[PDB]
């Protein structure tokens, strides 16, 4: 999704079945993904998977896990409770850690989608 | 036998239609009522939703959750018969919807 246009964001929310949702934990949430979340919420919720990137917070891993628990709590209160999100680290040579990537691909392999009326 | 519906404290019910749309008096006990299809029995009963201002969240066939009511007094407009209040709609608590924390998905 080109992230500068509700003109696209609305109809992608209409057609999509899975949405993996790209927060950056260095910055917390943003109103672009809040807008997209409400558009999906009103047009009918597709299956949402959180992923939080840019975990180069500091050497302060206490801050890292505190921001991660705030993100997962704000995520659970806003898509269904206990929804799945994956913590991606920094990019290593063009792409992400293949461990978390393989686990993510496993979950979307066993996603088991659902009907919506529209 | 341990409850108003089987033994469960809550039961998912399919809303048929909003009772008392055309009541003129706001916040009236005819207005804050709604027909609901019990699934584990499969039959139609009528139920309350408190705060007819937040009646308008639940509309039609939105798998609401149906709890007990428990009249703790003798209110004036309170009709008898109903003992079912609505506690959630489509998964999310409509009390939380009324104080506008959460959001109703569809």
């Amino acid at each position: 999704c080109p992230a500068d246009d509700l003109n696209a964001m609305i109809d992608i929310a209409k057609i999509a079945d899975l949405v993996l949702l790209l927060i950056d934990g260095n910055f917390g949430f943003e109103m672009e993904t809040m807008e997209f979340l409400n558009i999906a919420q009103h047009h009918g919720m597709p299956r949402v998977l959180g992923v939080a990137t840019h975990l180069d917070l500091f050497k302060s891993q206490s801050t890292l896990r505190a921001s991660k628990k705030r993100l997962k709590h704000r995520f659970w209160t806003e898509v269904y409770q206990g929804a799945k999100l994956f913590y991606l680290s920094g990019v290593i040579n063009g792409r992400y850690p293949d461990r978390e990537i393989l686990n993510l691909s496993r979950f979307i392999s066993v996603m088991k989608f659902r009907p919506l009326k529209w | 036998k341990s409850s108003p519906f089987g033994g469960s404290s809550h039961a998912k019910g399919i809303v048929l239609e909003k009772l008392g749309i055309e009541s003129k008096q706001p916040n009236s006990a005819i207005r804050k009522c709604v027909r609901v299809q019990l699934i584990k029995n499969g039959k139609k009963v009528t139920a309350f939703v408190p705060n007819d201002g937040c009646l308008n969240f639940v509309d039609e066939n939105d798998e609401v959750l149906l709890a007990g009511f428990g009249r703790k007094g003798k209110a004036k407009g309170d009709i008898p018969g109903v003992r079912f209040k609505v506690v959630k709609v489509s998964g999310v608590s409509l009390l939380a919807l009324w104080k506008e924390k959460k959001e109703k998905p569809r």
């Binding site: - | 033994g7 469960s8 039961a11 584990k40």
Partner: peptide
């Protein structure tokens, strides 16, 4: 028990739709 089961079996109740 029946207490931890007769409230949790309502997770199997929904609106009947088709896919």
């Amino acid at each position: 028990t029946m207490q931890r089961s007769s409230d949790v079996n309502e997770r199997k109740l929904h609106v009947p739709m088709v896919d």
